[PDB]
Amino acid sequence: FRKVMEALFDNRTRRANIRNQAYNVYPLYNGDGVPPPRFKNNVFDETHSH
Amino acid sequence: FAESIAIYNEAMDNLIQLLTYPVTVPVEPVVQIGETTFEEATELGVPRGA
Amino acid sequence: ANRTVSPSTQGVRPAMRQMYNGRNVATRPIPLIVDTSEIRAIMAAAADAR
Numbered sequence: 429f430r431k432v433m434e435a436l437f438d439n440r441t442r443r444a445n446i447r448n449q450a451y452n453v454y455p456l457y458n459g460d461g462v463p464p465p466r467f468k469n470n471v472f473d474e475t476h477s478h
Numbered sequence: 479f480a481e482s483i484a485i486y487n488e489a490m491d492n493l494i495q496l497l498t499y500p501v502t503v504p505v506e507p508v509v510q511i512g513e514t515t516f517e518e519a520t521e522l523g524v525p526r527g528a
Numbered sequence: 529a530n531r532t533v534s535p536s537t538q539g540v541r542p543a544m545r546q547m548y549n550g551r552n553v554a555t556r557p558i559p560l561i562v563d564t565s566e567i568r569a570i571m572a573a574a575a576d577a578r
Binding site: 509 | 576577
Binding site for chain 1: 569573577
């Protein structure tokens, strides 16, 4: 239960590996990773956060 | 302590079943748009590509 | 007898009705206006993001 809640509340980006390849593991929007797509002329830059 | 432990256990089950799901790996789509335009025809020339 | 006439005695019943007024009920639905252009933008964006 702590790790379920911590996955949502801890706003930092994590790192993980599969098959000799590395990637970011993300919480909700936090200013890291692919920005949110455009919607009805709302447009989001990379620093967008929830 | 089975009384208070059952209260704690239920509250966490309710949260977990609303906050969590078994993973899957969708291909996440990028909305970028390429387009073609028609052109007005002439009796000797030819139109542009796509 | 009374021979009196008017555009009303010669007329038609007004075909009137009561329209919703929000009185004498416990709650009132939120007045959520949604024009079709906004429905198109939602449905297009949902189908793009899927």
